[PDB]
């Protein structure tokens, strides 16, 4: 049947391209399929004989058809379209026995399509588990041929009769018919690797009561787990996966964390579905330490073996998740530490240090005011490098990593302006510690800094106007300035000592109690995501009330004040602008506190430490 070759042609064609690292995969010589004798299937007038002579002549030929050979009277017609080989009892035979043969002949047909399984699924292409399904179903064909002979030894002495055989061949119309079922089901649809190991752990529960047959299904399926478990005794214990024919559930893409290793759902064998997640985990963790050297050896290695109702094939996988993902987590924690690096991220990105910020701002202020395309990138990389060398922030070792980025957008990116609002920072990270603090984590860290910038930027200007004035008789702006100071000095006490300092303490404790990289990449995902949500950053309106209050404030600090446009260094026109600004400020200030009440306490809880401005007006 050529159609078979096409199935074979497709299997090999698909296999080769998937991996060309190993070439010339084994292929059987052609003469094997072409010659028909490797596989099993291929005078006196009966009418005038004595009845007993008919029974002893039939018992003689039937004893031949039980093995794959034609008989002088019972014979096989060509299969043609119908797969099972129906037979042609010689015509004009006793009508008493013609019926009895049809009760013993159903054995040679449940054997005709059982060697046709073993003499097909021997091909390497059919897989490394379809292989032993059909080479541990060969030992059964050897016992069968032993029985057919022992019965001839009785036939030789006149001691076997159609009835005696009918009792004798009953044991082999089941032990060889369970085999003619798995064979027409593994073949049905198609099955390779784990899919076959699940069709032999389904047809095992169905026959859970017969017992005569249950043990045979368990011998067939305790033998087909032998190839796969050797592969799962590697990916679980050392990172290497052999997988020569794409059989294993965890394939490895050439390309990392997202796509290098992937669970293939159809191939997953049924009895590991619950523990499939643990398998991928233990190996991925073992591989990232095995490319940088270190140690991949497992102190205890055991031979995971199949069983039914007593499963150690769900236990040894756990003594591997609890060693592999506990050696990786501690490698990261004392070599290529992320406890120390995280502190040298907090020191600059989260504005913890105060020395670095005061020395730097003054040194770069002249350049900072300039519009972009007039900015000097090398001069900003030189000025940063010094501001750091002069600060107390010189002492820490991981500082060299800081670099200056240039986000064209200024929180507008959230979905050509001034240097003050185009100042970004990127801290370079090595491949081993990158796994946790990846590009996604740093970008959000970057956004938290860009917003914290304005609040730091305005605080220095108010303090700037206060000294310039203290010509000095005017006391109109001595109060509007005072009110702005309370909100922008109390936002920086609420943000710094509630949203960031306690939450950072909650991550630095939770990291000491972590179990795996899956757990750790969570807590750091935690502090970054949850702390950003507590600050005003997370709002659909983005609390633009904050955006328009800081824009108008700068209008008061420099756009209008301009240090009194150097009046100290007129018509009361600036007293009208103070008034116009004061009413814009009250409207905007109200919108925020009301928004703080309507959406999701402490900033309101203490701004009114003595009911100050308790209700200038009440909405609706």
């Amino acid at each position: 049947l050529q159609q078979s070759l096409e199935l074979k042609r497709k299997m090999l064609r698909d296999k080769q391209n998937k991996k060309n690292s190993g070439q010339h995969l084994p292929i059987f010589p052609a003469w094997v399929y072409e010659r028909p004798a490797l596989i099993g299937d291929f005078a006196l007038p009966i009418g005038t004989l004595p009845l007993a002579s008919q029974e002893s002549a039939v018992v003689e030929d039937l004893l031949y058809v039980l093995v794959g050979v034609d008989g002088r009277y019972v014979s096989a017609q060509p299969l043609a379209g119908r797969q099972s080989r129906t037979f042609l009892v010689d015509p004009n035979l006793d009508l008493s026995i013609r019926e009895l043969v049809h009760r013993i002949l159903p054995v040679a047909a449940s054997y005709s399509a059982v060697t046709r399984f073993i003499e097909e699924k021997s091909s390497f292409e059919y897989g490394q588990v379809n292989h032993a399904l059909a080479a541990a179903m060969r030992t059964l064909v050897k016992e069968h041929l032993i029985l057919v002979s022992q019965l001839e030894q009785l036939h030789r002495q006149g001691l076997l009769s159609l009835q005696k055989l009918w009792f004798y061949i009953q044991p082999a119309m089941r032990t060889m018919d369970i085999l003619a079922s798995l064979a027409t089901s593994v073949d049905k649809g198609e099955c390779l690797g784990g899919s076959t190991l699940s069709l032999l752990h389904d047809r095992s529960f169905s026959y859970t009561g017969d017992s005569q047959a249950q043990e045979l299904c368990l011998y067939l399926t305790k033998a087909a787990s032998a190839p796969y478990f050797e592969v799962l005794e590697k990916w679980i214990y050392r990172g290497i996966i052999h997988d020569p024919y794409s059989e294993f559930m965890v394939e490895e893409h050439e390309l990392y964390w997202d796509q290098r290793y992937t669970i293939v759902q159809q191939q997953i064998p049924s009895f590991l579905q619950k523990m499939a997640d643990k398998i991928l985990s233990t190996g991925k963790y073992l591989n990232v330490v095995r490319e940088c050297g270190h140690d991949v050896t497992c102190p205890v290695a055991k031979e995971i073996i199949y069983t039914l109702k007593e499963r150690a094939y769900v236990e040894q996988i756990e003594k591997a998740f609890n060693y592999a993902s506990k050696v990786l987590l501690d490698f990261l924690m004392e070599e290529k530490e992320l406890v120390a690096h995280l502190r040298s991220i907090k020191r600059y990105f989260l504005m913890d240090q105060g020395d670095f910020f005061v020395h730097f701002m003054d040194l770069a202020e002249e350049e900072l005011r300039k519009p972009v395309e007039d900015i000097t990138p090398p001069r900003l990389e030189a000025l940063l490098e010094l501001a750091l060398r002069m600060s107390t922030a010189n002492t820490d070792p991981f500082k060299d990593d800081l670099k200056i980025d240039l986000m064209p957008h200024d929180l507008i990116t959230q979905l050509a302006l001034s240097g003050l609002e185009a100042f970004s920072f990127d801290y370079i990270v090595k491949w081993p510690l990158s796994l946790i603090i990846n590009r996604k984590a740093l970008t959000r860290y970057q956004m938290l800094f860009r917003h914290m910038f304005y609040c730091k930027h305005v605080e220095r200007q108010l303090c700037s106007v206060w000294i310039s004035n203290k010509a000095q008789w005017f006391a109109g702006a001595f109060t509007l300035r005072q009110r702005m100071l309370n909100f922008v000095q109390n936002i920086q006490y609420y943000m710094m000592f509630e949203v960031m300092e306690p939450t950072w303490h909650i991550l630095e404790k939770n990291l000491k109690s972590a179990s795996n990289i899956d757990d750790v990449l969570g807590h750091h995902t935690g502090f970054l995501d949850t702390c950003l949500k507590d600050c005003m950053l997370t709002n659909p309106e983005l609390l633009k009330v904050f955006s328009k209050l800081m824009s108008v404030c700068v209008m008061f600090t420099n756009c209008m004040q301009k240090f009194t446009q150097s009046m100290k260094l007129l018509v009361s026109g600036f007293e009208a602008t103070i008034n116009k600004f004061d009413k814009n400020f009250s409207a905007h200030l109200l919108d925020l506190l009301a928004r703080l009440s309507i959406y999701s306490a402490s900033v309101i809880s203490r701004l009114d430490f003595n009911g100050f401005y308790t209700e200038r007006l009440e909405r609706l």
Partner: protein, 60 residues
Amino acid sequence: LDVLNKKYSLLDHMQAMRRYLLLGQGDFIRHLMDLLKPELVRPATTLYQHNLTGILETAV
């Protein structure tokens, strides 16, 4: 009835239920009625959850 008893608590939460919700404490419900008097004697509509929540913390 030992896990639910300790890891999570059925006994501790069923007994404090006597005090906080059923008024079993008495000492606490007197203080709550001497601080929440003025805000309650207001009209109903004006009040909002954040207002009422605030007080509970002081008395506990």
